[PDB]
Design a protein around this ligand. Sequence first.
Ligand SMILES: *[C@@H]1O[C@H](CO)[C@@H](O[C@@H]2O[C@H](CO)[C@@H](O)[C@H](O)[C@H]2NC(C)=O)[C@H](O)[C@H]1NC(C)=O
Ligand SMILES: O=c1[nH]c(=O)c2[nH]c(=O)[nH]c2[nH]1
Length: 471
Amino acid sequence: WSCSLLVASLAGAFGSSFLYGYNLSVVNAPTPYIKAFYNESWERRHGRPIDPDTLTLLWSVTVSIFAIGGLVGTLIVKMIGKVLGRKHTLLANNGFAISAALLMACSLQAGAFEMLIVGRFIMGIDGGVALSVLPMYLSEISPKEIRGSLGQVTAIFICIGVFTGQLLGLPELLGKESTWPYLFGVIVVPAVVQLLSLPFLPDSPRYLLLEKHNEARAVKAFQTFLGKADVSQEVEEVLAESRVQRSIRLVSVLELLRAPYVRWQVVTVIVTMACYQLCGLNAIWFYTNSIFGKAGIPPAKIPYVTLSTGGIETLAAVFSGLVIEHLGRRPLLIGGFGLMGLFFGTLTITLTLQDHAPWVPYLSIVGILAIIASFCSGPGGIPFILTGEFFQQSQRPAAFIIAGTVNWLSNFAVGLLFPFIQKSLDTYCFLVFATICITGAIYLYFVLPETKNRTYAEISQAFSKRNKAYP
Ligand SMILES: *[C@@H]1O[C@H](CO)[C@@H](O[C@@H]2O[C@H](CO)[C@@H](O)[C@H](O)[C@H]2NC(C)=O)[C@H](O)[C@H]1NC(C)=O
Ligand SMILES: O=c1[nH]c(=O)c2[nH]c(=O)[nH]c2[nH]1
């Protein structure tokens, strides 16, 4: 480690990954105060009281519109990444983080509810842009000794995000009736702590050697991050990789989706990425107070019981490293989506017998904590790794658009629908996530070949038996 690599890692993550993790839990705690402002703001403009379904819809849209922001933001990186660079994107990106926080936090004074829905969208653009650039920036600057470890550092800062959003929402802090706009207005601090930190650090070495054509700056960037005298070895390596890679014909998204010699590597990334969101963990983050409310937990205690979830999330993510490498890929993706099946099952029991005894509701807490801990000691970080290990650099840039598009449309499709599933089934609503998790686990059992300590040549050979075609 070196000083510049610490601040590049931390002030990178703290303004770019943490504000994804925060933005998918900050919306939980002020739920009963925001829905109330919609009610009034729909009377003083449209001249009649808001009906319960329209109110449930405006909230379902306010929560989930973030994911359409994430989709739009992901497809903006494809175009911007050729022009600005790695460092300057994570600066210019905080145009969105600040311009979205100043929309949302003024929504109560201005009286119009559009500013909060549009604010969530532009805040989604940040979450789509900065999750796509931060992994590439970190893995371009780092010594070739830890490029594997920092995949846990982008993830732990999501969890410390979802936890901080659950802490400030306690009624001791900003989650009161009067202060709720500052839950959104505080997003300016992580953004400005990044803008007053990253500019002084070097831009990524690679970008300064393969796209901006400056060896002297590339050497300075390598010397500053690696903290050693000679870097000609990495300079030559990166140019050597480029001398190979520059010959490659890239595959287009529409062409990758159809060719037979990769068909099960595309189906197995769409089916992993769908279940990674439709397993419903984001419905547990956005709507936790509703879930614990209907479980029969005492109304006065739900803010404090909720805070445990972001805790057990963060402890799970911190200990994620020492299972992902030790167990390989196959018994984790059949493990996680298998145990989330058992725990959505037993949750549905404890929600339904919630009044057959006085102690049962507190087993619905343990049920949901085991759903969280089965995800992070498990699938939490793996699908974006597997998307890389199935494909060559010829295909991989297009594969990340398929695997990125399925992700955001699934985050949207569970964040928007959950209030309507819950209203229609009551205590049995979690049998939907039980059915999708176990369908994911039965699928990956019959398809996914092991990936740890296996070459691209071996993996592709295993899929050839069902692709029934070759390059
Ligand atoms: C929207 O707000 C109004 C109040 O501004 C709510 O109406 C009150 O609801 C309570 C509980 O049912 C009644 O005791 C009051 O008499 C109602 N007041 C009026 C003026 O009707 C209304 O329920 C809210 N709507 C929703 C769906 O939240
Ligand atoms: O560790 C994670 N926790 C989440 O809550 C989450 N959500 C997401 O999209 N990726 C991750 N990763």
